[PDB]
Structures are given as C-alpha cells and as structure tokens.
C-alpha cells in the first residue's frame, strides 16, 4: 500500500530554480507530515523542512529558509519542494519521507538526483 513516488532526475544550471515533487499513495495524506532530506556524498544527511498537509503548517531548516518553498496539494496528494539560487552545493539526492508525531521518516521515497552544472 504505502508508496511515496518521487519525480525524476534533474540537471540544472547555477542560479536557476527547480521544483521537485512526491506523490503519496496508500495512506491518508492529511494525517502525516512529509519531510525533505538532502544526502550529499561524504557530507551525510541534512533535513530541509517539513509540511503537514492537514493545515499547511511548515518547519524549515534555518539554513534553507530563504531558498526553499514547501507546498502540498491535497486533491492530488502531492508535496512539492522548490529550490532557487542553485549552486554546486545543491547537487545531491533529495528524499521525501513520511513523518508523524515523534518521527520524520518511517517510509522513504527512492531519491531524486539533482545535478547543478
């Protein structure tokens, strides 16, 4: 049942803006948080932010706040992350994960790779 399906690979140029998405299926979208995790080889993992589709509440990592916008569309059970001002530091694999009270990711999407070049 539970599926978090992410959009595909993105190649973009420095200074551009990209929007990535995660479609959730197999659970009620408005009873869970959707978190976004960045994995950069070597660097390990970094949390970007989270949105609760039930009332649109968001938490952002202070590092990413200006450059990230998180949204969700409940009719399509899809969450979006828009990143702007891309630099080479943004090249990484991005994951959507399902969270709730006390946890950020019981189910993880497959990862979407972003290369800025």
């Amino acid at each position: 049942e539970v599926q978090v399906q992410q959009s595909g690979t993105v190649v973009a140029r420095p200074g551009a803006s990209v929007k990535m998405s995660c479609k959730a299926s197999g659970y009620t979208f408005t009873n869970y948080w959707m978190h976004w995790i960045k994995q950069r080889p070597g660097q390990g993992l970094e949390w970007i932010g989270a949105i609760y589709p039930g009332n649109s509440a968001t938490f952002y990592n202070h590092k990413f706040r200006a450059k990230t916008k998180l949204t969700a569309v409940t009719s399509t059970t899809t969450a979006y992350m828009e990143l702007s001002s891309l630099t080479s530091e943004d090249s990484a694999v991005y994951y959507c994960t399902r969270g709730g009270h006390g946890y950020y990711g019981d189910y993880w999407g497959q990862g979407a790779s972003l290369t800025v070049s």
Partner: protein, 112 residues
C-alpha cells in the same frame, strides 16, 4: 545547532548483541529529542527503524530496540544477523530542527 555524534564503525559477530549510541553536544539526549534511527542499505535503500526514542517502525524485526542509556540515545540489536550489515543514522529533534549524526557503519563477521 547542536552537533550529534555516533561511532563511525563497529564490528560484531552473528548472534551477539551490539549497541549503537547517539550523543548531543549539549551533554544529554532527552525524551523531547524524539531520537530516530534509520538504516541505509546499498543502493540508497532507506528503512525507518525507530521513532520517538523507542517506538519500532512498521515491520521492523523485534531484535531492534531503542532507549535512552545514561546521557545518550541507543539502538540495541539483540542477536545481530548478517543482513544487519548497513549504515545506521541517528537524528535528534533539537530547536525545531532534525539534526543527523554521521552514521555508524556496522560490519557483521562471516558469510502492501
């Protein structure tokens, strides 16, 4: 904000109990930090293991348990199996951020 620290690498044998720890640079990990543990398998395969310090995620084997031991959050694997060979990441909720440890690579000896 805080720095979260884990052992870089541990080796165990099949059938042994192994414990992995997770520390906060503030000196102690509390229940309010909701310590989370996830497993990374080859090919970017991530499985959520433990949330809110000791709650096993859906479908996780009973040999995995989480708790607070002393000043640290801990993941204990009672009776390690070869399939437990993986990287384990701890994350703590601190000042409204999830902050990740660097991961512990666990080596296990031997061969809808």
């Amino acid at each position: 904000q805080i720095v979260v620290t884990q052992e870089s690498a541990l080796t165990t044998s099949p059938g042994e109990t192994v414990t992995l720890t997770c520390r906060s640079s503030t000196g102690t990990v509390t229940s309010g930090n909701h310590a989370n543990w996830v497993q990374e398998k080859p090919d970017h395969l991530f499985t959520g293991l433990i949330g809110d310090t000791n709650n096993r995620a859906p479908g996780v084997p009973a040999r995995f348990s989480g708790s607070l031991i002393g000043d640290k959050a801990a993941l204990t694997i009672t009776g390690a199996q070869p399939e437990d060979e993986a990287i384990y990441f701890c994350a703590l909720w601190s000042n409204n951020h999830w902050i990740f440890g660097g991961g512990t690579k666990l080596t296990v000896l031997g061969q809808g």
